[PDB]
Design a protein around this ligand. Sequence first.
Ligand code: HEM
Ligand SMILES: N[C@@H](Cc1c[nH]c2ccccc12)C(=O)O
Ligand SMILES: OCCc1c[nH]c2ccccc12
Ligand SMILES: [C-]#N
Length: 381
Amino acid sequence: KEYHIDEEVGFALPNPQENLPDFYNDWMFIAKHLPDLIESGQLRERVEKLNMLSIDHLTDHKSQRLARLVLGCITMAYVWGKGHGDVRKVLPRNIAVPYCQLSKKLELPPILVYADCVLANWKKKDPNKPLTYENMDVLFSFRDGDCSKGFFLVSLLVEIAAASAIKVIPTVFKAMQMQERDTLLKALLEIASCLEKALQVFHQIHDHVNPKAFFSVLRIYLSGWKGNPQLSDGLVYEGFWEDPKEFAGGSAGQSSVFQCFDVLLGIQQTAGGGHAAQFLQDMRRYMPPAHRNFLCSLESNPSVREFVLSKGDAGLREAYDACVKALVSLRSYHLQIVTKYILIPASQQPKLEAKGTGGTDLMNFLKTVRSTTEKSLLKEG
Ligand code: HEM
Ligand SMILES: N[C@@H](Cc1c[nH]c2ccccc12)C(=O)O
Ligand SMILES: OCCc1c[nH]c2ccccc12
Ligand SMILES: [C-]#N
């Protein structure tokens, strides 16, 4: 079965739509000139003075996902505004109704998710040149000097690097079924190599994303309205819903690729009934329908951990541990990123636990997730 996985990019949208049809030019002009409109402070006036447009004219899947990115970026720009404190609790019917109808059609929440701002928000400058940062550029930004290009593309490049292991997954379960030791050993080491390579692509974040520019500018526009003191009851969608509704902000916890390795290796991140387990499970509803199907498809298969444990095979245990060590390394490095990009900039701000964009007590959350990964290390059985 097909889960919209590409051979070249993985779970990213393969060469996404760059521009909407002529009927939706009113939405496109607002989203493209978004840094200018916020800085002037005239964004909120133009969204209110807009016409309610029907979503029927959107032809294909690539167009529909771009429209989610267009309307999603505008919604975040309308709510947070300049990003200082003054917020809009109400989203006008002219934008709220078409966005909710598109969200329901694509089985996604009416909020900017990872699939919009990362997986669909990219273009390559030269089509003949291979996929690299210097050849790539984002489609939409929130502000000037907010490091949108560096942040969204590095996240995408790590996604693509790790997605090289997705093609190895069919080999893993076939080797278990056919009872093929040498094949499974080579397959697991290949996955471990991909995750080690993804860590090297991660290093690029320091070059292209500024710590102060991320925290005080860009981070506010990725934040949502679930477990948020600024929008306590949430957001009222005028015309569509009767009561204010809570929805979580964007995170890479909404990525299928990164959740899939925990599932493949039998790292029970979603089990336990804890706050960390609850978040990662809830974020699957913030993923595309096809990507959600892939995750439980992996859960439906025999456990790789249980297979390797029963064998009494030092080489097969080592190859399995190589994957787990690679995931620990990525999560240890991610926490170092958190120190540089959240923790240190937060202490520099002028006049109790810190919360992420997704809506978690981040330091306790991320360490629990890493601890669960560390516990999965076999260490000679
Ligand atoms: C600007 C740099 C980054 C910061 C400050 C950051 C911070 C965080 C925070 C606070 C969370 C907790 C969830 C939430 O409340 O939002 C989180 C989760 C996560 N981040 Fe990041 N992150 C960054 C970049 C990345 C990148 C580039 C990746 C990989 C492409 C990544 C992968 C993840 C994953 C997979 C999770 C879910 C928890 C887990 O499985 O470990 N992050 N991040
Ligand atoms: N969760 C991060 C922001 C973030 C990192 N990667 C993302 C991908 C998509 C949306 C948001 C993000 C924070 O709280 O600072
Ligand atoms: O939180 C660290 C980022 C991360 C978790 N799982 C992954 C799999 C591949 C690449 C990065 C990650
Ligand atoms: C990273 N969220």
